[PDB]
């Protein structure tokens, strides 16, 4: 009567743990790309942002450095671009973007702890499937968040937008928020591609860890 209860828990724990790694890797990849400077630096020359924005390369890079420094959850000050103006609707939008990254990070630290605490409880029990269930669940998670796009393309992006932001009938107007000119749509598309690229690598390493383990367990 008891080992029927115990098996019902380790399958629940494997679920809670598997989902926790799926999200942990999603967050970790997101933060690697958002706070990463290699990709955007590459896009300055690739997308010819100096001529898009009528700004020098050094201009563009130091404004970007200040923005990424602002988006740290540990920078308590307001956003003060070195050479660019900014509407109050602009400042609001960047507080929205910053709020997500703090929300994501706080949940990430939560899933990281549950994933390894619950993960070692399972490994102490000679059980490895959370490393395999997780591995495939990390591939599935980031785009289950994209699933609404398949149902309706323009309308789904109206809820993604309003889930994030605090002003509905705003604008991208370069005369009032000229940092738009150095943040073209292609940059965000490539960045998201880097986010999943990182997630894909993440799924592999923890699938490798599943196979390295269970092959040394069956060896005995
Ligand atoms: C007690 C309340 C605590 C709050 C948490 C309750 C949430 C549990 C949800 C359903 C129970 C079913 C438990 C086992 C379900 C099977 C898990 C499963 O679907 O396995 C595939 C997945 O990828 C992972 O392995
Ligand atoms: C945890 C904090 C301390 C340690 C971290 C320091 C903070 C990182 C800031 C700048 C370096 C960014 C440069 C590295 C960016 C590499 C990853 C990236 O996102 O760009 C690669 C791109 O995907 C391929 O084209
Ligand atoms: C349980 C799920 C897996 C557990 C994993 C344990 C944590 C591993 C810590 C760092 C690995 C990668 C961290 C990538 C982001 C940290 C660096 C960062 O944010 O700075 C910007 C970055 O340097 C620009 O590339
Ligand atoms: C969506 C997946 C992309 C993956 C993440 C890559 C992007 C993260 C790097 C920088 C974000 C900074 C810009 C984020 C958007 C700022 C909002 C904006 O454009 O400002 C509005 C305007 O100023 C007032 O109307
Ligand atoms: C509910 C919160 C629980 C309390 C919190 C306890 C701390 C989390 C424990 C381990 C994380 C260690 C591995 C994390 C890898 C670091 C990657 C990272 O966090 O980079 C983001 C950074 O802010 C880029 O600017
Ligand atoms: C594919 C998986 C991707 C993972 C995603 C995780 C969520 C990241 C959350 C916030 C990052 C900042 C989001 C900022 C998005 C703004 C994109 C945009 O198009 O900004 C308008 C720009 O002005 C056009 O020219
Ligand atoms: C043992 C119990 C613990 C179980 C834990 C499960 C094992 C997860 C393994 C790998 C996940 C790592 C995924 C990391 C993906 C983020 C991509 C990244 O960090 O990029 C590098 C960064 O840019 C550099 O500067």
Author numbering: -7 to 212
What does the paper say about this structure?
The His85Ala and His85Arg mutants were chosen for complex formation since both were essentially inactive with this substrate. His85Ala and His85Arg were crystallised in the presence of the FP2 substrate and structures of both mutant forms were obtained. These observations indicate that His85 is not essential for the expression, folding or stability of Lit. Our conclusion therefore is that the density observed in the substrate-binding pocket of these two constructs corresponds to structured monoolein molecules. In the His85Ala and His85Arg mutant structures obtained with crystals grown in the presence of the lipopeptide substrate, a different kink appears in M3 that causes it to curve away from M4. Curvature in M3 is such that it separates from M4 toward its extracellular end to a greater extent than seen in wild-type Lit. In so doing, it acts as a gate to create an opening between the two helices that leads into the putative active site. The particular ‘open’ conformations captured in the inactive constructs likely reflect the fact that the catalytic residue, His85, has been mutated to non-conservative residues. Indeed, in both mutants aromatics that include Phe149, Phe152, Phe157, His153 and Trp162 have rearranged in a manner that may facilitate opening the M3 gate.
Here, we report the crystal structure of the Lit enzyme from Bacillus cereus and describe its mechanism of action. Lit consists of four transmembrane helices with an extracellular cap. Conserved residues map to the cap-membrane interface. They include two catalytic histidines that function to effect unimolecular transacylation. The reaction involves acyl transfer from the sn-2 position of the glyceryl moiety to the amino group on the N-terminal cysteine of the substrate via an 8-membered ring intermediate.
